[PDB]
Amino acid sequence: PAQPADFQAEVESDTRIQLSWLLPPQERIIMYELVYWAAEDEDQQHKVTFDPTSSYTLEDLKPDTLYRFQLAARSDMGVGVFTPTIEARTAQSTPSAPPQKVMCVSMGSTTVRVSWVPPPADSRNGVITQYSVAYEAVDGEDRGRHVVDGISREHSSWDLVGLEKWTEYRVWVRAHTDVGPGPESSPVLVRTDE
Secondary structure, three states: OOOOOOOEEEEOOOOOEEEEOOOOOOOOEEEEEEEEEEOOEEEEEEEEEEOOOOEEEEOOOOOOOEEEEEEEEEEOOEEOOOOOOEEEEOOOOOOOOOOEEEEEEEOOOOEEEEEEEOOOHHHOOOOOOEEEEEEEEOOOOOOOOEEEEEEEOOOOEEEEEOOOOOOEEEEEEEEEOOOOEEEEOOOEEEEOOO
16 A cells, blocks of 8 residues: 655646656556545545556646645555645636626717626636727728727726717627637627717
């Protein structure tokens, strides 16, 4: 029941972590027992048993989450001593949800202010870096899509200026991270004040 040595975690992707360790010098190991859990949620811990191998990769994980691991080998004597716990955090990814509670109210003849709220945390998959408001006119002079990038994460509302007068618009807004942009919000209608 010797504790496995040289236990090391490697971050392969945003949802896949590879665990490696030194195989014992021909020790009569039956199975390996791996126990891991999310650092933010200690109550739910996961356990997996597998045949004697040198490495094991975990899949279907959550991005931007810290996972801690412990390993032991069970022989004909029983389950050995667990390895000292190691931790590894998954990489970031694009958001899996649009900004919620999207709204917009006309401010004047050529100004329309749009507001939103950051998406839920369980689908952010990283740090929200910026936003992007997309909109198209309907009854306006030009029916051309316009988008505004670089919307910093500090504010939750942006003012669209220079548009047409007394006309309807559709608005879209999506979250952004270093990996890429997330899904856009559902379109919301708005009519320009005159």
